[PDB]
Amino acid sequence: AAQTNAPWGLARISSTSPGTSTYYYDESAGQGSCVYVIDTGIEASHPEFEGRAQMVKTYYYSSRDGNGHGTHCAGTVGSRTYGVAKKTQLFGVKVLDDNGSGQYSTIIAGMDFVASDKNNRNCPKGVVASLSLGGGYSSSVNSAAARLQSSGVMVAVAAGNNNADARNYSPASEPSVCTVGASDRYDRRSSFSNYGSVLDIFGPGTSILSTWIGGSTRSISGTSMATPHVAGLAAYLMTLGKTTAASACRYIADTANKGDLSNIPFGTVNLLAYNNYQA
């Protein structure tokens, strides 16, 4: 299956070179898999979700996404036009308020919810968690994400937008999960993206067009944009049966475009997420 004039991020994860515009992917498109978007909530009524997105838990007065960040990331995972796995199930866990901030104990509770809620859903191909958030280091937040990954969920988290080493940021510094850095359309590391040994993979992060609240679309930048790319890629690869939740991050690093990114500091992996699809 091919989508022409795809967002540059989708065309890049299906190509070995930059500057393409077609996103190639298997037509299974993540059918049978689930992705929890642990963010500001999802506007499930957005036409681009086709009724495949729903809110399952909120920690605030409403499950409505008043920010739009959670909808943008849910779009990059599995929206029709802006989504990697165009046929995946999207579950909205709202751990942040409409300003985009939240407490660690709420984010930790939101991660423990996913580890239990997945036993009530039908996701035979597997379950993925996209965590487009982060702050200072927290051993309890790190152990929370380690708990989520240990329960059988592919945990993709953002590396942070501090232009610094991601060892000082949680849950980015938790080694058991998938820590995703950001790159731009010219195969440079995004100027904001964090780096370091703890990073596992890079994804398209700068100027990512996806869904927004009010049924609209907009393009934004951040490592929180590259994380849904990898989370949607994991669901895509898990539906194809090529990997499991416990091994998806290592598999994505195994089959990634090696050495394609510039501005990669020494000690940081030079791997860019790549679906390796051959039509």
Chain residues in the site for Ca ion (CB under 5 A) = 16-17, 175, 200, 260
Of 26 and 260, nearer to Ca ion (C-beta) is: 260
Among residues 130 and 217, whose Cβ is nearest to Ca ion? 130
Q: Is 98 considered catalytic here?
A: no
Diameter over CA atoms, the chain: 47
Q: Cβ of residue 278: shortest distance to Ca ion, in angstroms?
A: 16
Give the CA distances from residue 175 to residues 123, 180, 220, 229, in Å, rounded to whole numbers and listed in that order.
25, 12, 27, 19
260 is in an annotated binding site: yes
| Shortest distance (Å) from residue 249 CB to Ca ion | 6
Cα angle: 117, vertex 62, 88; to 5 degrees: 45
DSSP 178-238: EEEEEE-TTSBBPTT--BSTT--EEEE-SSEEEEEGGGEEEEE-SHHHHHHHHHHHHHHHH
The catalytic position among 39, 65, 184, 187 is 39
Among 98, 221, 224, 229, the one annotated catalytic: 224
The reply to whether 16 sits in an annotated binding site is: yes
Catalytic site includes residue 28: no
- Minimum Å gap between C-beta 64 and Ca ion is 33
Q: Is 197 a catalytic residue?
A: no
- Considering the candidates 14, 15, 65, 69, report the single residue annotated as catalytic: 69
Torsion of CA 242, 13, 154, 93, to 10 degrees: -140
Residues with catalytic roles: 39, 69, 224
Binding annotation for Ca(2+) = 16, 175, 177, 200, 260
